[PDB]
Every structure is written in C-alpha cells, then in structure tokens.
C-alpha cells in the first residue's frame, strides 16, 4: 500500500464491502431453499423445404423455428460485438493488438448474418428467407460471385 489515498480508499472499500458480505452470509444462507431451473431444448422441425405446398400447420411450425433461430443468430452478432467491445477497452495502447484478430470474427458474422436473414424486412417468414437462398444459389451458379455485375 504505497500510495496514501489508495491506502485510504482501501479503508472505505473495507467499509462498503463489510456489511454487505456480512448480510450475504447472515440472512441469506440460513433462509434459502434449493431449487433448479433448466434451459430449453426445442426439437428440430421439417423446414419449409420439407413441408408441402399447403400444410399451414407445418409452415407455421417452420416459421417459429426460423424466428427463434433468427433471434439467436441476431444475437450471435451482438455477443461478438460485446466481445470485440471488451478488447478495445482492454488497454489504451491495446487496440491493434487484437482488433483485427478479434473483430474479423464479428465481420464475418455480420456478412453471414446478412446473407441468411438480411434484406427481408419485417414480416419475413421462413418461406421468403428460404427461397432467397435458392435465388442466391442460382445467381452464384449463373452470373458468378455477387459483386461483379453480370456477363
């Protein structure tokens, strides 16, 4: 404890941490019942490709799977962003130390996320998303890499 005020700030840190941690050990542990809460595992579903032309229940099941999957992949972009966020905060000199090595994961994630879900807008269901992939596959095979115009 070289510094004086830091040797004092510790004192208030002992002051603040004291009662709370005492409270935790005093009126929680002798008053807590044990209970468990698990985490969903939704079964897979026959996607739009599988379902028939007019199988409204099946199509409805596929979209809900698509939405939940959207919400997760929607998220995986966020987490990678939060992850990159931490690194840029890591150290003041430390930006180029791990920005590109870490950000580029987020970069790939965005582009992949766009391709699957992007460009559809709200109301978008499994059908419009799924067929968009079909259209992109056709374009890739015919006109080559997207980002070249046409021949």
């Amino acid at each position: 404890p070289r510094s004086p005020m830091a040797s004092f700030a510790e004192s208030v840190l002992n002051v603040i941490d004291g009662p709370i941690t005492w409270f935790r050990e005093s009126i929680v542990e002798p008053n807590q019942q044990k209970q468990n809460w698990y985490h969903q595992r939704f079964r897979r579903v026959p996607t739009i490709d599988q379902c028939y032309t007019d199988d409204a229940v099946c199509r409805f099941e596929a979209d809900q799977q698509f939405r939940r999957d959207r919400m997760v992949d929607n998220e995986i972009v966020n987490i990678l962003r939060q992850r990159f966020e931490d690194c840029t905060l890591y150290e003041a000199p430390d930006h180029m130390v791990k920005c590109r090595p870490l950000m580029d994961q987020y970069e790939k994630a965005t582009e992949n996320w766009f391709i699957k879900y992007g460009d559809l807008g709200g109301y978008a269901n499994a059908k419009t998303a799924y067929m968009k992939q079909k259209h992109r596959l056709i374009w890739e095979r015919r006109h080559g890499p997207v980002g070249s115009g046409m021949k």
């Binding site: 005020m5 830091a6 700030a9 929607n74 966020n78 905060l89």
Partner: protein, 241 residues
C-alpha cells in the same frame, strides 16, 4: 422545504456529493481506471439499445467542479432571490440542470447523450423564460430553437451510427476512422457541438442568455450547454483531427 431554506437543502447535499466525486476522481487517476457500466433496454436486428454511464477521471472531475460551482451558485441565489416569488420553482430547475448535466457528461453512448442533450435544452428554456418580460420570451425561445437544431443533428447522427452496429462511439472511432459514414457521423456531431457551443453562424443566442437571472447566467456559462458542447467534441477527438 418547509422549515429550512431550499438553498440550504440543496447546497449541503451538493457539496457533499461533489467532494465524494472529486475524491473518486483521484482514485481513477492513481489507478487509471475506466468503467463502462451498462443497462440494456431492448435489442432488435442485432442492435442493443443501452443506457450507459462511463466513469473516468475526466468526467468525474468535470462534474465535480460543475457541481461545487452549482452549490456556490445556489448559495448566492439565497440572497439574489431574497425577495422573489417562485424561489422554490427557481431552485428545483437548477437541480434539473445539474442532474441533466451529470447525465450528458457521463453519457458514453450517443443515445445517452441525446437524453442529456435535449434535457439541457429542456430545462434551458425553463430558466431563461423564468421572468415574464417579453425579452425573456424572445431570448429563451431563440435559445431553445438554436439548441433544437443541435439535437436534430444528433438525432440524424443516430441514423448513420447504426451502421457500425451500436452507439458506443469511443470503441469504434480509432478502428474505422477513414470510413465515409464515420466521417459524416462526426460531421453531424460537429454541427450539434457548434450549436450548443454558440459557434458562428450560430453565435446568436448566448447573447440571449442574458434575460435569465444572473445565477442562471452564471450556471449557463460556467459549465453548462456551451461547455458540454465542447465536451462532446473532446469525447470525439479522432475524426476531428
């Protein structure tokens, strides 16, 4: 506010709060810490709308001095409003300035800034229009519209700042300087800082800061809208240079 002067009531807690902030600022300096506490509201399309408070020696020191001066300003008002009606009205407004200033300073996210920003304008109109003379009408109404132009620029700036996936600017500035979007995001931020900072050609309302009581004039010029305007810019160094 029934047996003791409101000036006493706010003054004592203000001095108490900012001395605590001042000493915490030292702690931040001797350790060089930067905390970025965050409480998210909603998130759609992979974006995260978040109320963020960044704590650094800069902001803490800034709000510190702002708030001792707040305390001393209100103490002076304890006499300069000796014979005024609506003293209590006047004082709670002063606190709203101080609170709105706290949020604006600490705001590390463009959205959090927008809260404080128009919040400053929101109370700025109130304590300028405090009197009921037609000059105060003209003066405050000019200032409020001048500020609103600034807020709009921030509001537009939100649109393009969506591109980089968030509104936490201090973590993208360096990594993506040269980009056209970040270029103009600074441009709109640049314009909004001009308006609150009364830069020419917008330097037409700080003269209209004179209809308010000279306590308000003190706390509008000491560390207030204009200072927070440049304080937005100091937070945005990279692209400007």
């Amino acid at each position: 506010m029934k047996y003791l002067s409101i000036c006493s009531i706010s003054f004592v807690n203000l001095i108490s709060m900012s001395l605590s902030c001042f000493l915490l600022s030292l702690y931040f300096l001797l350790n060089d810490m930067i905390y970025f506490i965050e409480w998210e509201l909603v998130s759609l399309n992979s974006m995260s709308i978040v109320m963020t408070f960044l704590f650094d020696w800069m902001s803490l020191l800034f709000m510190s001095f702002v708030l001792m001066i707040s305390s001393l300003v209100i103490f002076y008002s304890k006499e300069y409003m000796m014979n005024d009606n609506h003293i209590n009205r006047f004082i709670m407004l002063v606190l709203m300035f101080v609170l709105s200033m706290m949020l604006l300073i600490i705001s590390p996210n463009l959205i959090s800034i927008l809260l404080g920003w128009d919040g400053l304008g929101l109370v700025s109109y109130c304590l300028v229009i405090y009197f009921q003379n037609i000059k105060s009408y003209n003066a405050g109404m000019l200032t409020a519209l001048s500020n609103r132009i600034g807020d709009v620029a921030l509001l537009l700036s939100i649109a393009w700042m969506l591109n980089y996936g968030s509104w936490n600017y201090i973590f993208y500035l360096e990594i993506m300087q040269n980009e056209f979007e970040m270029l103009m995001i600074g441009s709109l931020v640049m314009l909004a800082a001009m308006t609150k900072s009364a830069q020419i050609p917008f330097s037409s309302w700080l003269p209209a800061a004179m209809a308010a009581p000279t306590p308000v004039s003190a706390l509008v010029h000491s560390s207030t809208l204009v200072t927070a305007g440049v304080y937005l810019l100091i937070r945005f160094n990279i692209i400007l240079s």
